[PDB]
From Swiss-Prot:
The lineage of its organism: Eukaryota, Metazoa, Chordata, Craniata, Vertebrata. It is found in: Nucleus. It comes from Homo sapiens. Keywords: Nucleus, Phosphoprotein. Its main location: nucleus. The chain holds residues 55 to 221 of 225 of the full protein. This is Thymocyte nuclear protein 1.
């Protein structure tokens, strides 16, 4: 399995709290690792639960001015409870979640490297749209299939094409 994980590159307040966290903030983490908290989308959650140690995931910046894939990271820790679903403080708090059996989960990713060059959502859309008429590996990419999924699986095909655009100028 291969994945795509979205996060806020530039600052933005939610329920009063800032959810900012780009690829650089991950690199700036001890051992360049962090807990990918926040996810409250059932379909997104069930993917987090299905991730295996070692599998890789593109770090996607969900920005307005410059959305795209800036780098790569890996899963070093399998799903477990998201501590913030309970902290009444956090904007992702959930009253319906029992500590006895949490509804929300998270995983731990470690930084690996950056793309040999940034990949704009614009670049991804054109090829995607292109393949969507000629027949290509990005014909059914989730990034364009699910406009609102923060955690997404990618077939080796799509993954191989994203990496190939990395070796182009």
């Amino acid at each position: 399995s291969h994945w795509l994980m979205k996060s806020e590159p530039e600052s933005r307040l939610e329920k009063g709290v800032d959810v900012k966290f780009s690829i650089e903030d991950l690199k700036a983490q001890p051992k360049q690792t962090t807990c990918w908290d926040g996810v409250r989308n059932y379909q997104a959650r069930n993917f987090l639960r299905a991730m295996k140690l070692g599998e890789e995931a593109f770090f996607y910046h969900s920005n307005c001015k410059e959305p795209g894939i800036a780098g790569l990271m890996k899963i070093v820790k399998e799903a477990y409870p998201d501590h913030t679903q309970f902290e009444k403080n956090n904007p992702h708090y959930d009253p319906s979640s029992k500590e006895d059996n949490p509804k929300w989960s998270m995983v731990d990713v470690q930084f690996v490297r950056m793309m040999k060059r940034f990949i704009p959502l614009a670049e991804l859309k054109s090829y995607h749209q292109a393949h969507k008429a000629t027949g290509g590996p990005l014909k059914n990419m989730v990034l364009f299939t699910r406009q609102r999924l923060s955690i997404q699986p990618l077939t080796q095909e799509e993954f191989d094409f994203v990496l190939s655009l990395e070796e182009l100028e």
